[PDB]
């Protein structure tokens, strides 16, 4: 057995995957088999979700997280997010579940049967971690693959049916995107926006033309950078800046994945465009706004003058001003005045919420939507009791947004921890002190005392 | 056909179970291995032919 | 629901997503059988 | 002394624990204490 015990490999059983650092064939098998696990879960979960899926309930009432992703891509849904065809969800699950067997077979093959290292079998497939030019070549292949993957989303949106547009005129509907936003002052303008409130960085993207046009820019950037990395070698400043080792490249990815995990947590929590509320439930801000609207509507129907009602503090009970003068809902939801949603935007004028439209133009579909969203706020217990912590058992509800945000915060955090673990270790291992201080040349004993 | 669908799907379930056990036990026994590659080559191509059978017969059963 | 022809595999589908978790556990079984060397 | 491999004992005992705790989690949703 080659490198399969601690004495030969230097790593204990619980650090057992580190025995694969220089065994590229077994390491390839680890990765392909793990890719099979990911594809298996995507397949097995979708089929689980579909087997449980009641078509007459909203998706967010059903503890589904994958079916909403498919519905957002345009498959299976009609106007307002209602499900018209369960069969695309079945196909996505099945095809993932079958492809996981192929990835699983090739992972297991290279892990246990095939050559332990690839460097003798092939010069193209073998690699040294220290071979900087080979590393950029594999990086370049993978960038081209990811860039085509972004263009697939563009292909679906433009030439294969469209995407679910929650902002479409007349209600949410699957809409083909014909004019994506190509202009880089808009696309790269999102990158320069503040992440703070009212701004939201890239999380505030609020139309599918910007989403699609960004993915055009990303696909071409990734293909161009892919080609660039196949044709160049890391410049001198890059070679002096980085650690060039397998553990170091892993650490760099862990830093990147953690950052992406944190961004996804915010995307699912705040964005109702690529995470439509008809599939994922209302956002936290959306439900709080929906409550103020609901009681505005009820109280106005009873005869209340809503623009002139004082709350207990003296601020307007239903309506007040934001710190820049826009007319906004009152109460605690004053914090969420930057919320924008297709059920609320028809009440907004130039100065914010228009009081004449509020008096005259609230439709019954908005009243139903506000009540539905207020009663499906992303608040629930770990045993899936919906509502505040003080609520009784009855409602079985935790919003997908809560499940998705909490999970991805947890994952992003530990991946930050992993980045710090592996980045520190790769630094120490490259400098040669990862196993401890050498008793003969202890560095601190050669230093002058601090005092 | 009606009975042909689930029977071939229950064949695909059964055969996947022989492939899930039998493939790592045959890749990790390199002694009597030339006799096991044929059953791997057979079971692999038989499995792929059953996915296509289930996939084709889905569109007469659904 | 699954397409109605597939309705006998519902008990199998119900347990499919947990199968990845068993792979993690399986690595501990395999290591126990080699004695964690 | 060394009849049954300790890994087999560990695995069956480990799985016996899972089944028993999984039953207790099943009982959280059924019968007494389920809120239904």
């Amino acid at each position: 057995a080659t490198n399969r015990d601690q004495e030969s490999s230097g790593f204990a059983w619980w650090a057992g995957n580190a025995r694969l650092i220089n065994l590229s064939g077994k390491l390839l098998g680890a990765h392909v088999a793990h890719a099979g696990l990911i594809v298996f879960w995507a397949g097995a979960m979708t089929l689980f979700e579909l087997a449980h899926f009641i078509p007459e309930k909203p998706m967010y009432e059903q503890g589904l997280i994958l079916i909403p992703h498919i519905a957002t891509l345009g498959w299976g849904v009609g106007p307002g997010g209602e499900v018209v065809d369960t069969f695309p969800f079945f196909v996505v699950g099945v095809v993932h579940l079958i492809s996981s067997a192929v990835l699983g077979f090739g992972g297991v093959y290279h892990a246990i049967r095939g050559p332990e290292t690839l460097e003798e079998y092939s010069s193209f497939f073998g690699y040294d971690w220290k071979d900087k030019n080979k590393m950029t070549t594999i990086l370049g292949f993978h960038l081209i693959v990811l860039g085509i993957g972004a263009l697939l989303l563009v292909a679906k949106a433009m030439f294969f049916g469209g995407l679910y547009d929650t902002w479409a005129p007349g209600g949410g509907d699957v809409r083909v995107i014909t004019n994506p936003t190509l202009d880089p002052r808009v696309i790269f303008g999102y990158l320069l926006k503040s992440p703070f409130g009212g701004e939201g960085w890239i999380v505030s993207v609020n139309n599918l033309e910007d989403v699609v046009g960004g993915h055009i820019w990303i696909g071409l950037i990734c293909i161009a950078g892919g080609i660039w990395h196949i044709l160049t070698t890391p410049f001198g400043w890059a070679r002096r800046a980085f650690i060039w080792s397998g553990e170091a490249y892993l650490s760099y990815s862990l830093g990147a994945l953690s950052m992406m995990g944190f961004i996804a947590t915010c995307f699912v929590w705040f964005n109702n465009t690529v995470y439509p509320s008809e599939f994922y439930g209302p956002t936290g801000p959306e439900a709080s706004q929906a409550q103020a609207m609901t009681f505005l509507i009820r109280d106005q129907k009873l005869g209340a003058n809503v623009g002139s009602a004082q709350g207990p503090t003296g601020l307007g009970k239903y309506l007040m001003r934001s710190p820049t003068g826009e007319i906004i809902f009152g109460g605690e939801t004053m914090r969420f005045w930057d919320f924008r949603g297709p059920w609320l935007e028809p009440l907004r004028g130039p100065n914010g919420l228009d009081l004449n439209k509020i008096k005259n133009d609230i439709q019954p579909w908005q009243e139903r939507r506000a009540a539905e969203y207020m009663t499906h706020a992303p608040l629930g217990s770990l045993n899936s009791v919906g509502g505040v912590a003080t609520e009784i058992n009855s409602v079985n509800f935790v919003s997908p947004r809560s499940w998705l945000a909490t999970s991805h915060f947890v994952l992003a955090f530990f991946f930050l921890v992993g980045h710090l673990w592996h980045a520190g270790r790769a630094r120490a291992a490259a400098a040669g002190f990862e196993k401890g201080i050498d008793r003969e040349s202890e560095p601190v004993l050669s230093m002058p005392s601090l005092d | 056909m009606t009975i042909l669908f689930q029977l071939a799907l229950a064949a695909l379930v059964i055969l996947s179970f022989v492939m899930v056990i039998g493939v790592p036990v045959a890749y990790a026994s390199p002694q009597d291995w030339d006799r096991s590659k044929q059953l791997i080559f057979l079971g692999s191509g038989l499995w792929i032919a059953l996915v296509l059978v289930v996939g084709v017969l889905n569109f007469f059963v659904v | 629901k699954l397409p109605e022809a597939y309705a006998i595999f519902d008990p199998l589908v119900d347990v499919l997503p947990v199968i990845p978790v068993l792979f993690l556990a399986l690595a501990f079984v395999w290591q126990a059988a080699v004695g964690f060397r | 002394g060394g009849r049954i491999p300790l890994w087999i004992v560990a695995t069956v005992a480990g799985m016996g624990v899972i089944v028993i705790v999984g039953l207790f989690f099943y009982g959280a949703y059924a019968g007494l204490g389920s809120s239904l």
Partner: peptide, 27 residues
């Protein structure tokens, strides 16, 4: 129905290990 599928799936992993343990496999 559900309890017997998880039992047959839950034994397939340990059976791979046990079968390679008895044939002196490459564990």
């Amino acid at each position: 129905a559900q309890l017997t599928m998880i039992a047959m799936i839950g034994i397939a992993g340990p059976m791979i290990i046990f079968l390679l343990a008895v044939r002196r496999g490459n564990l």
